[PDB]
Amino acid sequence: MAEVIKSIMRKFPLGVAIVTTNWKGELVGMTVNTFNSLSLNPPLVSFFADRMKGNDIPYKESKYFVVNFTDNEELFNIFALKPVKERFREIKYKEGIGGCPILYDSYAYIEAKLYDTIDVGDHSIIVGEVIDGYQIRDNFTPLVYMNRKYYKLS
């Protein structure tokens, strides 16, 4: 079989973010490399959630979600590798719209309201309608994921 299709994606640089929500009282988040702007009028953003792993379910059952933009590699690792029950013990967060956690170490975030979801193959596209966003820290180092690694920008 051609699994050259995975090898090409591993060399394709992608921006990363951490999406959180409050899921019936349970604080959850995850590192994503599928976040993007989908539409400007109306202002929709989206990301892709893995259905096999059940990453889609939390966001399908909540009304809001926050996109956290940060430059601390360690946080990306926490929200990809640590057990789900341990994630919010180790970091500083404040509560935001609908109880959703905003990471303290974010340089920016966007709060959004779930707008639609769409199952395509083994992922769902989760679309949210933007309702606010703030730039908090002005001086930061944006990161990209490529080949299991995070790179600063040249």
Separation between Cα atoms, residue 122 and residue 97, nearest integer Å:
29
How near is the Cβ of 41 to ligand FMN at its closest, in Å? Answer: 14
Q: Give me the residues that bind ligand FMN (CB under 6 A), please.
A: 16, 30-34, 47-50, 53, 55, 79-80, 84, 145
CA distances (Å), 41 to each of 25, 35, 67, 70, in order?
32, 18, 19, 26
114 binds, among a copy of itself, ligand FMN, none (CB under 5 to 8 A by kind): none
143 binds, among ligand FMN, a copy of itself, none (CB under 5 to 8 A by kind): a copy of itself
Helix (H, G, I), strand (E, B) or coil at 26: strand
Q: Give me the residues that bind a copy of itself (CB under 8 A), please.
A: 2, 4-9, 11-15, 17, 33-44, 46, 48, 69, 108, 110, 116, 118, 120-123, 125, 127, 130, 132-135, 140, 142-144, 146, 151-154
Separation between Cα atoms, residue 126 and residue 37, nearest integer Å:
12
